[PDB]
Design an enzyme around this catalytic site. Structure first.
Site, mmCIF file in Angstrom:
data_model
loop_
_atom_site.group_PDB
_atom_site.id
_atom_site.type_symbol
_atom_site.label_atom_id
_atom_site.label_comp_id
_atom_site.label_asym_id
_atom_site.label_seq_id
_atom_site.Cartn_x
_atom_site.Cartn_y
_atom_site.Cartn_z
ATOM 1 N N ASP A 1 -17.785 -0.477 11.003
ATOM 2 C CA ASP A 1 -17.927 -0.566 9.450
ATOM 3 C C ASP A 1 -17.735 -1.797 8.803
ATOM 4 O O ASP A 1 -16.900 -1.744 7.673
ATOM 5 C CB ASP A 1 -17.673 0.701 8.580
ATOM 6 C CG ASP A 1 -17.867 0.688 7.251
ATOM 7 O OD1 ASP A 1 -19.222 0.600 6.942
ATOM 8 O OD2 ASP A 1 -17.080 1.154 6.499
ATOM 9 N N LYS B 1 0.859 -1.157 -0.023
ATOM 10 C CA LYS B 1 -0.061 -0.031 -0.061
ATOM 11 C C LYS B 1 0.912 1.317 0.169
ATOM 12 O O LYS B 1 1.483 1.676 0.985
ATOM 13 C CB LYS B 1 -0.954 0.148 1.051
ATOM 14 C CG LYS B 1 -1.835 1.405 0.796
ATOM 15 C CD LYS B 1 -3.088 1.237 1.891
ATOM 16 C CE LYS B 1 -3.113 1.736 3.011
ATOM 17 N NZ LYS B 1 -4.637 1.576 3.945
#
Ligand SMILES: Cn1cc(-c2cc3cnc(Nc4ccc(-c5cncn5C)cc4Cl)cc3n2C(=O)OC(C)(C)C)cn1
EC number: 2.7.12.1
Length: 262
Positions: free
Chosen positions: A132, A38
């Site tokens: 979430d 990333k």
């Protein structure tokens, strides 16, 4: 294309996903081993945003020693201009996997759930409540589910824009602090409902406006069609209890016959 992290050279195979100022690459080191890198561009990042990135790295680092159901972070580079996170590479995320795999195996679903419970349980003991949870946050790494996101930083989307179905009733009916570990139990319950019935509990609701009222209303009874796994049906009913107080806990779910018996 090629990239360098802590004096180590990685050759880019393809871009797995992207986010805001971030990109996830499927790379190879000098030894031909696979990793997920990333890259974060911090050039236009505000202090609140830099802090989400800083916290993700810290929690990914602390959690390493506590569970192997949390994505492995092998190395990281942090300057004022960028971030590089060298992670283990999974085969596919659970969302993209659930779209391809029509019928789910009872033993695979069971094993996958144990993995999700251990990962979410680990974040809970370290003071993190995700809030979430979605299948995209879980990754298949050598026939095992590992948690990759903590709701800390912005979510990464796959490359070849989100869902409302996994949202808890207390999180939607919040606005008028009620974010407890029980919120993650609901979201996990929706993933297991998806893995059992092939749809999320409120996938029936076409429009997103009327969908939120359905997660809130107690008169809107959720459907639980009979299954040969009576154990699984009780897990699904307990996770999807609208009142967080009545909803089952993660330490309770780990002691459930569905997780512990044959
Ligand atoms: C904290 N953090 C962790 C990550 C992250 C690490 C990571 C490690 N392996 C993978 N493999 C992977 C995952 C999915 C797909 C795919 C998507 N549609 C179909 N297919 C087959 C292909 C691969 Cl090769 C991804 C990784 N991450 C990550 O976000 O995947 C996304 C962007 C997918 C959410 C990013 N931020």
């Amino acid at each position: 294309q090629s990239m360098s992290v802590k004096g180590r050279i990685y050759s880019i195979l393809k871009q797995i996903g992207s986010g805001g100022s971030s990109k996830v690459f499927q790379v190879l080191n000098e030894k031909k081993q696979i990793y997920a890198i990333k890259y974060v561009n911090l050039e236009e990042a505000d202090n609140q945003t830099l802090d989400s990135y800083r916290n993700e790295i810290a929690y990914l680092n602390k959690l390493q020693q506590h569970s192997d159901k949390i994505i492995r972070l092998y190395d990281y580079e942090i300057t004022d201009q960028y971030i590089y996170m060298v992670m283990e590479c999974g085969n596919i995320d659970l969302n993209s996997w659930l779209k391809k795999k029509k019928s789910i195996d009872p033993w695979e679903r069971k094993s996958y759930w144990k993995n999700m419970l251990e990962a979410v349980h680990t974040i809970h003991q370290h003071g993190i409540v995700h809030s979430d949870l979605k299948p995209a946050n879980f990754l298949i790494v050598d026939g095992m589910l590992k948690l990759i996101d903590f709701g800390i930083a912005n979510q990464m989307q796959p490359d070849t824009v989100g869902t409302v179905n996994y949202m808890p009733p207390e999180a939607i009916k919040d606005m008028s602090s009620k974010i407890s570990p029980k919120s993650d139990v609901w979201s996990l319950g929706c993933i297991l409902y998806y893995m059992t019935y092939g749809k999320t509990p409120f996938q029936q609701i076409i429009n997103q406006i009327s969908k939120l009222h359905a997660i809130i209303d107690p008169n809107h009874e959720i459907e639980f069609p009979d299954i040969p796994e009576k154990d699984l049906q009780d897990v699904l009913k307990c996770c999807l209890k609208r009142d967080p107080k009545q909803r089952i806990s993660i330490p309770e779910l780990l002691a459930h016959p569905y997780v512990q018996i044959q």
